[model samples]
Target: QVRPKLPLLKILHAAGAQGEMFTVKEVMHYLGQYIMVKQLYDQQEQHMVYCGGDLLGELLGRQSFSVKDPSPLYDMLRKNLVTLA
Candidate 1:
């Protein structure tokens, strides 16, 4: 799949994920790094992810997320990817 949409691409690039295309797993890996580097994990709630950053906020289109249920996040990311069939 090609890299995510422009909004997501900018954030991923800022997180040092350099590439024009990536597999779903690869994007997930990059997102993990981005979250870790940015400390997006909620301190009070271990199962939650904080979408406080402007870039992340825009990409996820939400103010908060639950790490325990990541389907929504995955779905959102999938929408941005351009699969080559």
Candidate 2:
């Protein structure tokens, strides 16, 4: 696959939550796309499911995205899950 140096930055991509198949950075991408769609529809988050979920996940080909959280930080923060921060 093609790669980019620091300036070209392959853009660490993430999707879905921790322990998922994808990374968290892609999750952020999907969320930003969602926000843009909401702006287009003049809708707020409360109506996101009705207005955008199918459009984003199905029609727009944004698989692995989640309205649920992708909080990797939680693992670092949990006393029970003590590891590198």
Candidate 3:
């Protein structure tokens, strides 16, 4: 599987469209202060592919299958503005 990297200009333009213009160089300077997008995902285990059952465990520190508690998943199915939580 292969995943193409997002272009720098597209990302920069998105930042600008938010009504704030942050140049690529300025963002690059702050890159070390935060984790890069590459740090978050890879091809086999990226955004869409939930290969394992403990995805929620890794994210929220709790896994529903093992826990007896009811997980409060707010708006798990509805999508408006393609919104999710």
* Best-to-worst ranking by TM-score: 1, 2, 3
State the weakest 10-residue window (summed lDDT) of model 1. 52-61
Residue lDDT tens for model 1, 1-66? 666888778767877888678877877888878877888888877688888666787777788888
**lDDT (CA) for every model shown?**
0.78, 0.32, 0.28
The best candidate by lDDT is 1
lDDT of 3 by residue, 14-80 (tens): 3342322344344443221222232322355333322134332233333332113223222211210
Off-target runs (Cα >4 Å) in candidate 1 are none
Runs off by more than 4 Å, candidate 3:
1-19, 36-85
Models 1 onward score TM values of: 0.84, 0.24, 0.19
Candidate 3 lowest-lDDT run of ten? 75-84
lDDT of 3: 0.28
